[PDB]
Design a protein around this ligand. Structure first.
Ligand SMILES: *C[C@@]1(O)C[C@@H](/C=C/C(C)=C/C[C@H]2CC[C@@H](NC(=O)/C=C\[C@H](C)OC(=O)NC)CC2)OC(C)(C)C1
Ligand SMILES: [Zn+2]
Ligand SMILES: [Zn+2]
Ligand SMILES: [Zn+2]
Lengths: 65, 869, 842, 93
């Protein structure tokens, strides 16, 4: 279970859990077409630009520890 | 009452496109196009004689298509279709023109289901000779299958080969035309291991994107990570350049403001800046990237078509000295709406699948070459600060031969009989930006389109005049006045700081610039700024396309709510309230305040007379009439307002709403508040004592989009994640007792995001139904069952088709409709009607198990559709 | 420590036995000792030892050098006592060290090859696979030029067999480095002016490249053909034969694409057909036979009409290999589009059936199979009757093998094409030949049985006039002394029952049934099973009312047969009892049914799966017949009194009763049995409930509320076995009612399952985790997340341990659905934690 | 004990089972509802182990199936289900 990214243990910090769920969310946005559509309609940007901004946010979606 | 058992049917299939590929799928010399509508795989055939697109096959795959590519074996005559899905499976399909179906040739399993982070499915890349395919996740895991044929010329797949690399994110993957060498796959990767272990944030900015090459050794049968070169600026996707005998192998990295060519070995990297638009009205700090690409190979030459954010399509050619490439050449081809995929067919036709709005098929008339238009190159010198420039112009190289109607994206819908016909009409506010539209749909459907100016958010109908009051709002956009002001300031800057004696030339050029108003419909709208907002209030006749009155708003005022109502203080004269946010930043969220415009609606439902403008703390997101007064949601506050001479006057408020009010609907003295995340909240208004007390909520979090009250205790709602729920209060719930929790009596995943639910009767003299609309352009209905016999029959039909006719892309149907919540009391009719698509033996067996005959089952399903209810 | 050493390992690892301080070691011998220890840990050792030793031998391979490693590896591989898996381990270590020593092995290439090449001709398929693997890795490391220089001398050696080994090695290196990497060398060697052995070996290389790489040579097919084409007109005869054979292998590999690549080969072959004789003619014909199915219809017609003269001439060839070649060539020609059926019927069929269909060909097994398959393929184009009528009269032959051959051919043809092409004369010929072939049998040919059944089932209702003549033979055969012959007749009845029923000859079938009834005492078990299957086939097509002997008489005779220990008898008897119980249950009293129950309950623990399958089905049938009450009560008593495996069978039988008769008939009595104070009775009830819900699945969507109080009590009964079994029950319930609206009752039971998550006993915590996962899939991951969040972060380290175990289970279960259920975590001073994108509102 | 699942990535090889374990599910040890066909990795079907029982490596007679419960919970999507004894060499037994 250690190999699957996102799993945790008793010493999992708040930051680790939340960056995990943020990257999960970004990948879920990339996967589900209508979620990305909603996002691109909200902030008036092309779908490719929204995907690029999400992939850019994958580095530190929450900030440094 | 009894639990409601529902039956789901799609009346209008989804019309948006996320992927499009072209090839010889029939095995003949004709070329077809396979498109992905989201949860639907479709096959289209453009007729080169009449220049019009026909649909040959449409299939519900009951999954999420995340990647789509076509390939062909060596010496083959027909192209296969590889589909990356939200199941842990890869599928390869062959189209059979005789049976008119997608035969599943191969289905191989590797991971778990869902749009997961480390499970392959998102990216698909095939070797140009068809010898292998690679399915990749966005993180870590990558898998390669080897494709071959056998004695009988049937496709064969191998076991997966592991190409994983921990802590590695993937931007894009594509195969490299290395001829018949060891197949190679190029990936745009980035390692975040350094950025996570540096609590100062330096490693974040220091980590850079890499171009990596994965080689598949066939003789050794394994994948190895050979070359990995860091890149200067971050690129969004890759293009395979033809290699082997007809072209030099390599890759084209598309980045922000640049396009680079790179190849392994002594090949020098050759970059070229992207030509910006001359007199670009956008923000100077805004970059420019490519949104999609296409490739067309001929025995003579080959070129690429790359479209920018502004919709400009450029033709790209590669000039090569022997083995190496000298320079990249780019010239302005044309301007079409922003597309998600482009296909350059043989026999001279281009197919443009727009990311939103209608789709287009053009005939290529002149490739170019015989043009005086400037061609740009990567060798032309240019200072570090400057770039190339070009001027947009009307279509020259393409001609519109067909236009395909697409309702995506639908942002609001009202089903009502505004015309004096008997059957109700569907009034759908959809489209995006300058390509938005209000469409009247009538009895699969017949559509009439009236163009709008910005993206519609919500519209209301005036009961007395039957006219429509629409609000259109878009982010980072300029208003009409601000657009004219920017044009004038640009023209003033143009004449000044120019050379004397040639300032005469600057003046005539700037006059021409001011005279030219380029159509935002085709050329896109000049949109810029982070917190800028363009909003417009419109009055429209539902019969004609005419606009009756129009109100532009401030450069930072964005409308989000609208309602028309009579007031008890002021007789029967109508009013129009419009909620507006000011200085709204989406990320991170920050708003200065909000306003509520009160208009009089003076003429016979034709003119808006500004009464006053009430300020308020946060954005007014919901406005609904309530017994001679209005209920307004501002932020997480729910207030009752009454009309005053100079303001809208607060009379009672509720503060304990969880997060933020996104919509409110009332029946009786009960108000149903939709929260952005914490689902529905039942609040009660006490006329005596004038207090708004929360008496019920829900036990699950729901990102509610829309809602519709079925009865006094029952509410139907929709998710951002494409779900529909029906939640009912306990029967003996007292509005006096606070701690009451609602029970969810229905759950169902549509697979597409719903933005309008309405309980109506589509055909007079029919039963009631729950009609939902789709952000991807679909229209569906949920029908209540009349008897338990029909319920058991259709439930057994669902079971037998789940077993004997599984979804096409490896998904499990019961798992799929249980995407976020397990299914509760819904039957999937879109699956049940696939009984007519099975083979004779399967149909006979299923009908015999149902103790019926196959025509009888088809008749029953068709009858449920004839009811439309 | 050191692994165990077999007798044979002593020779190779003796030095490891003596204990010597590794300070007083020569530098070379120091390395020899470590390589010995590493190889011994690899060859004999646990998978951890193997993995660690692989890492160590590959990481230090460059420091170790190639010489000593390959010296210790080759004798180990050449050991005659090497077991098959040890060879695979050695091949893997060879690959992983050859990847490291890229250029280091270039000196030793030759040596390695002379040890490895025999593996390429070993009889073991995996031995050849491993040899090819290591030669490929060698060629990848050593490089093209090193391998070419190493193997080039033996190309012209006089011994044909060393040339064959060299050509196979070259084909392997071609598959390892690619066809174009060796294309110039092959172009040079195929036209070598030095000797003819060099060009023969180059053409053999091309042939083996085809044989090895199959469809992968289609890209370079034109290149290979152009390099090899000149060999067809050479002065040497052996090189012409081998060039034709290589062309044949290339055509076999490129099927069905790439005819245009052989454009410069058609006329040389066409001329050589009329020129050459003997083995070279056979090679030319084989090449043409593998080349025709690649052509167009009209050109296939032309070329086949061109070659058919010599093809017909070579039918009467004395050479057996030539016969096999021309037979395969005929099969290939007549299986293509373009060769017309009337053309085959006119020109090919008379000589075919004159020279080929003789008793001699039936004696050789290879020719037997070849001719049978070829004639069936011919029938697939020229028509069934046009083939059958030419050999149907041979069914009355003195030689039994020839009758067997024609029977197999007719069987396969009529099974592929039916009997619509057969006229009355051929029908009577078929019947009169088949009856004589069946009556005249020395052994018990299964081919005769299969053919009889196939012909009868293909004729269908057309066999009515012959049915008395057939049943007379079947009756006379059931009296025959040979038991295998009796079971053959019984299996014929079993296969022909349906057609007999369609023929409206129900009195003949009644006579057959009443004749089989007296044979139910057959001591030989296989014959008993066959006659039971025959009785079942007769029952299943004729009514239960007109069945003779009547069912009331038949079933009690079946009752004691269930005690037989033969699995064929058990299966057929249980299946016949089930056919009786499904529809004929009214003719049998409930007491006999209870005795059948008692015998079936014992058979629920048979080792063969089919017996348990049949026992479950027929017990369900007899449970619908009997009614729930009596069998239910006696099963509950058996549950109390019995334990171990025989209790599990009563649990299965209770679940069967619950599935057949609604669980409302069984659940009250079981839950009442829970009321007894004794703990063992309670454990039995809990096991019954677990298997009952696991068995009935969706049927339990209405009985969760009913069993909820008992589960409430059992989940707090202190006895860990109770809570373990109750958690299993909740698990099976959740998995069974998934998606049927049982969220209320299951959510309620979750609150009683939850407190038991803090338990150290391994089995019961395993059961509780399984129940929690089932509840996750039935309720939804959102509720499980709601229950996990309160303790995901907690001062107690053990509470965190347990709750994170649960959360990992949930997260692995449904990572994508959780995106909608994570709580709002507000931004703090240093980091941005709120998912702003989801807060957008349109 | 010392027995663990292979858990490597499964390939095109179909899992196989001997007579004594004909209808059992490799994971949960249940006979109720065979659902999806078992797939083993490419190493566990090599050489002498081809077509061998997943639990014992003995001669197999029937295809191995995951049950319906395991399919619902996607336990068929985990690694190769062949059993390996970490305390036995390849030559032993
Ligand atoms: C791999 C294995 O676990 C196999 C076992 C053998 C177990 C046997 C022979 C058990 C008998 C036992 C099985 C369960 C019960 N009977 C039962 O469930 C019968 C039928 C069911 C409903 O249907 C099927 O079985 N369908 C296929 C009671 C009797 O041996 C070991 C060594 C433990 C290894
Ligand atoms: Zn299982
Ligand atoms: Zn394995
Ligand atoms: Zn076994």
């Amino acid at each position: 279970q250690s190999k699957y990214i996102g799993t945790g243990h008793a010493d999992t910090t708040k930051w680790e859990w939340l960056v995990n769920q943020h990257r999960d969310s970004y990948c879920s946005y990339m996967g589900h077409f209508d979620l990305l559509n909603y996002f691109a309609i909200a902030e008036n940007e092309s779908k490719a630009r929204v995907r690029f901004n999400l992939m850019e946010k994958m580095l530190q979606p929450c900030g440094p520890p | 009452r009894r639990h409601m058992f529902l039956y789901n049917l799609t009346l209008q299939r989804a019309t948006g496109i996320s992927f499009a590929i072209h090839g010889n799928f029939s095995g003949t010399k004709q070329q077809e196009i396979v498109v992905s509508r989201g949860k639907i795989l479709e096959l289209l055939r453009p007729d080169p004689n009449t220049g019009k697109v026909h649909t040959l096959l449409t299939v519900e795959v009951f999954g999420v298509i995340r990647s789509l590519m076509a390939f062909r074996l060596t010496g083959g005559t027909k192209d296969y279709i590889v589909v990356g899905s939200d199941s842990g499976r890869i599928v390869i399909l062959e189209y059979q023109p005789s049976k008119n179906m997608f035969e599943k040739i191969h289905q191989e399993t590797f991971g778990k289901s869902g749009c997961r982070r480390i499970v392959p499915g998102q990216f698909l890349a095939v070797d140009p000779k068809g010898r292998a395919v690679m399915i990749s996740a966005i993180e870590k895991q990558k898998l390669v299958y080897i494709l071959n044929r056998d004695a009988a010329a049937r496709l064969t797949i191998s076991s997966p080969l592991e190409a994983h690399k921990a802590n590695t994110l993937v931007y894009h993957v594509v195969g490299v035309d290395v001829g018949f060498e060891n197949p190679m796959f190029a990936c745009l990767e980035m390692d975040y291991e350094e950025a996570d272990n540096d609590p100062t944030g330096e490693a974040a900015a220091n980590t850079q994107q890499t171009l990596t090459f994965y080689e598949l050794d066939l003789g050794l049968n394994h994948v190895v990570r050979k070359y990995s070169e860091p890149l200067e600026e971050h690129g969004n996707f890759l293009i395979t350049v033809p290699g082997g005998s007809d072209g030099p192998s390599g890759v084209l990295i598309c980045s922000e403001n640049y396009i680079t060519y790179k190849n392994f070995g002594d090949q020098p990297d050759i970059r070229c800046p992207i030509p910006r638009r001359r007199n670009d009205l956008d923000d100077p700090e805004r970059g420019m990237i490519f949104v999609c690409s296409a490739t067309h190979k001929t025995k003579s030459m080959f070129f690429f078509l790359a479209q920018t954010e502004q919709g400009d399509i450029f033709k790209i050619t590669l000039e090569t000295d022997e083995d190496m490439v000298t320079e990249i050449r780019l010239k302005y081809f044309d301007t079409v709406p922003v597309a998600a995929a482009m296909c350059v067919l043989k026999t001279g036709f281009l197919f443009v699948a727009s990311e939103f709005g209608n789709h287009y098929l053009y005939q290529i008339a002149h490739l170019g070459d015989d043009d005086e238009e400037p061609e740009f190159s990567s060798a032309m010198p240019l200072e570090e600060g400057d770039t190339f420039f070009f001027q947009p112009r009307p279509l020259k190289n393409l001609v519109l031969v067909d236009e395909l109607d697409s309702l995506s994206p639908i942002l609001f819908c009202q089903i009502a009989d505004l015309a004096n016909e008997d059957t109700p009409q569907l009034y759908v506010a959809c489209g995006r930006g300058p390509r938005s539209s209000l469409r009247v749909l009538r009895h699969v459907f017949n559509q009439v389109a009236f163009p709008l100016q910005y993206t519609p958010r919500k519209f209301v109908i005036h009961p007395e005049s039957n006219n429509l009051i629409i609000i259109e709002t878009d982010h980072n956009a300029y208003t009409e006045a601000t657009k004219a002001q920017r044009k004038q300031q640009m023209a003033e800057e143009m004449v000044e700081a120019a050379g004397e004696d040639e300032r005469e030339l600057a003046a005539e050029m700037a006059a021409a610039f001011l005279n030219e108003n380029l159509p935002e419909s085709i050329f896109g709208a000049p949109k810029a700024g982070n917190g800028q907002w363009a909003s417009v209030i419109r009055v429209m006749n539902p019969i004609q396309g005419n606009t009756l009155d129009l109100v532009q708003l401030e450069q930072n005022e964005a409308a989000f709510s609208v309602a028309v109502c009579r007031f008890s203080n002021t007789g029967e004269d109508w009013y129009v309230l419009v909620g507006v946010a000011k200085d709204l930043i989406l990320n991170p969220r920050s708003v200065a305040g909000g306003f509520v415009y009160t208009y009089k609606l003076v003429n016979n439902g034709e003119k808006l007379e500004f009464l006053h403008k009430t300020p308020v703390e946060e954005v007014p997101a919901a406005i609904a009439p309530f017994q001679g007064r209005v209920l307004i949601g501002v932020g997480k506050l729910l207030r009752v307002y009454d009309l005053g001479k100079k303001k809208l006057l607060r009379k009672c408020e509720n503060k304990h709403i969880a997060n933020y009010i996104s919509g409110i609907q009332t029946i009786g003295h009960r108000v149903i508040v939709s929260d952005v995340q914490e689902s529905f909240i039942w609040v009660r208004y006490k006329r005596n004592e004038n207090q708004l007390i929360i008496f019920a909520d829900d036990t699950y979090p729901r990102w509610v989009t829309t809602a519709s009250l079925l009865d006094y205790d029952t509410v139907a709602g929709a998710d951002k994640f494409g779900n529909i729920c029906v939640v009912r209060l306990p029967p003996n719930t007292n509005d006096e007792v606070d701690s009451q929790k609602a029970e969810v009596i229905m759950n169902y995943h549509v697979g597409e995001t719903v933005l309008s639910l309405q309980k109506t009767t589509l055909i007079p003299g029919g039963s009631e139904s729950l009609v939902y609309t789709t952000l991807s352009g679909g229209i569906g209905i949920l029908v209540p069952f009349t008897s338990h016999e029909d319920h058991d029959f259709f439930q057994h039909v669902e079971m037998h088709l789940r077993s004997e006719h599984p979804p096409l892309c490896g998904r499990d149907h019961l798992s799929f409709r249980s995407y976020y919540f397990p299914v509760k009391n819904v039957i999937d009719g879109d699956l049940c009607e696939q009984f007519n698509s099975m083979e004779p033996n399967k149909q006979k067996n299923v009908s015999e198990e149902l103790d019926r005959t196959p025509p009888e089952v088809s008749k029953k399903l068709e009858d449920i559709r004839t009811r439309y209810a | 420590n050191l692994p165990f050493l077999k007798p044979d390992d002593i020779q190779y690892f003796d030095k490891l036995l003596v204990d010597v301080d590794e300070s007083t070691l020569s530098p070379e011998e120091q390395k020899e000792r470590k390589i010995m220890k590493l190889l011994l840990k690899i060859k004999n050792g646990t998978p951890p030892m193997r993995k660690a030793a692989l890492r160590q031998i590959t990481d230090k391979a460059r420091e170790f050098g190639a010489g000593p490693l390959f010296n210790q590896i080759l004798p180990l591989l050449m050991s005659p006592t090497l077991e098959d898996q040890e060879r695979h381990l050695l091949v893997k270590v060879i690959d992983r060290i050859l990847y490291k020593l890229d250029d280091l092995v270039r000196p030793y290439v030759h040596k390695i090859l002379v040890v490895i090449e025999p593996l390429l001709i070993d009889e073991d398929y995996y031995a050849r696979v491993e040899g090819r693997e290591i030669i490929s890795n060698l060629a990848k490391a050593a490089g093209l030029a090193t391998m070419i220089s190493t193997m080039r001398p033996d190309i012209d050696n006089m011994d044909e067999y060393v040339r064959n080994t060299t050509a196979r090695a070259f084909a392997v290196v071609a598959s390892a480095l690619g066809i174009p990497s060796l294309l110039p060398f092959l172009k040079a060697v195929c036209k070598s002016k030095k000797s003819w052995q060099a060009r023969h070996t180059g053409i053999k290389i091309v042939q083996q490249i085809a044989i090895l790489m199959g469809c992968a040579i289609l890209p370079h097919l034109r290149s290979l053909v152009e390099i090899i084409e000149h060999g067809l007109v050479d002065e040497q005869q052996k090189v012409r034969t081998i060039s034709a054979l290589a062309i044949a292998a290339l055509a076999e590999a490129a099927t069905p694409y790439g005819i245009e690549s052989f454009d410069s080969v058609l006329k040389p072959l066409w001329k050589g057909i009329r020129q050459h004789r003997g083995k070279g003619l056979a090679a030319f014909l084989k090449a043409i036979g593998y080349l025709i199915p690649l052509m167009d219809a009209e050109y296939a017609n032309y070329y086949t009409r061109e070659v058919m003269l010599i093809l017909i001439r070579e039918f009467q060839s004395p050479d057996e290999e030539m016969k096999k070649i021309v037979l395969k060539v005929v099969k290939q020609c007549c299986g293509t589009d373009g060769v017309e059926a009337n053309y085959i019927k006119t020109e090919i069929l008379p000589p075919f059936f004159k020279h080929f269909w003789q008793h001699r060909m039936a004696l050789d097994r290879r020719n037997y199979r070849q001719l049978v398959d070829t004639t069936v393929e011919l029938a697939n184009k020229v028509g069934a009757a046009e083939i059958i009528s030419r050999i149907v009269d041979d069914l009355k032959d003195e030689a039994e093998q020839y009758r067997k051959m024609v029977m197999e051919t007719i069987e396969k043809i009529m099974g592929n094409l039916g009997a619509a092409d057969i006229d009355h004369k051929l029908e009577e010929q078929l019947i009169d030949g088949i009856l004589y072939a069946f009556q005249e049998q020395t052994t018990e040919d299964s081919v005769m049985l299969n053919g009889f059944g196939t012909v009868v089932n293909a004729l269908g209702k057309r066999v009515k006039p012959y049915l008395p003549q057939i049943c007379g033979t079947v009756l006379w055969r059931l009296n025959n002394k040979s038991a295998k012959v009796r079971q053959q007749a019984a299996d014929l009845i079993s296969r022909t029952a349906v057609v007999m029923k369609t023929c409206q000859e129900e009195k003949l079938m009644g006579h057959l049934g009443v004749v089989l009834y007296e044979y139910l005492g057959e001591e030989y078990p296989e014959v008993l099973g066959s006659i039971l299957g025959a009785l079942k086939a007769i029952v299943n097509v004729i009514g239960m009312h007109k069945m003779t002997p009547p069912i009331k008489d038949l079933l009690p005779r079946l009752t004691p047969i269930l005690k037989n220990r033969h699995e064929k008898v058990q299966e057929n008897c249980i299946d016949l009892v089930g056919r009786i119980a499904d529809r004929g249950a009214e003719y049998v009293s409930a007491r006999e049914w209870m005795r059948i129950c008692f015998e079936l309950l014992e058979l629920l623990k048979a080792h063969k799966k089919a017996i348990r399958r049949a026992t479950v089905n027929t017990f369900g049938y007899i449970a619908k017949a009997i009614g729930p009450h009596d069998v239910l009560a006696t099963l509950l008593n058996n549950l109390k009194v019995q334990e171990r495996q025989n209790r599990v069978c009563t649990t299965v039988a209770i679940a069967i009763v619950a599935e057949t008769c609604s669980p409302f008939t069984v659940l009250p009595a079981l839950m009442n049995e829970y009321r007894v104070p004794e703990l063992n009775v309670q454990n039995g009830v809990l096991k019954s409930l677990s298997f009952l819900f696991e068995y009935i699945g969706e049927m339990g969507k209405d009985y969760i509320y009913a069993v909820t109080p008992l589960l409430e009590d059992a989940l707090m009964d202190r006895d860990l076995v109770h809570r373990q079994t109750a958690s299993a029950v909740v698990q099976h319930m959740s998995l069974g009612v998934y998606g049927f609206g049982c969220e209320d009752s299951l959510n309620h039971l979750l609150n009683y399952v939850w407190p038991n998550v803090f338990e150290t006993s391994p089995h019961v915590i395993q059961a509780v985790m399984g129940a929690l996962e089932g509840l996750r899939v039935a309720i939804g991951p959102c509720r499980m997340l709601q229950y996990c969040l309160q303790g995901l972060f907690h001062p107690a380290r053990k509470v965190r341990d347990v709750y994170w175990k649960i959360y990992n289970s949930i997260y692995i279960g449904s990572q994508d659905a959780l995106i909608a259920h994570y709580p709002r975590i507000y931004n703090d001073d240093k980091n941005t934690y709120i998912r702003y994108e989801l807060d957008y509102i349109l | 004990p010392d027995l663990i699942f292979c858990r490597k990535q499964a390939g095109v090889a179909i899992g196989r089972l001997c007579e004594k374990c004909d209808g059992k599910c490799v994971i949960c040890d249940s006979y109720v509802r065979p659902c999806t066909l078992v797939r083993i990795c490419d190493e566990c079907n090599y050489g002498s182990y081809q077509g061998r029982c997943v639990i014992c490596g003995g001669p197999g007679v029937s295809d191995a199936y995951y049950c319906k419960e395991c399919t619902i919970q996607e336990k068929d999507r985990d690694g190769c289900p062949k059993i390996v004894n970490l305390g036995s060499s390849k030559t032993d037994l």
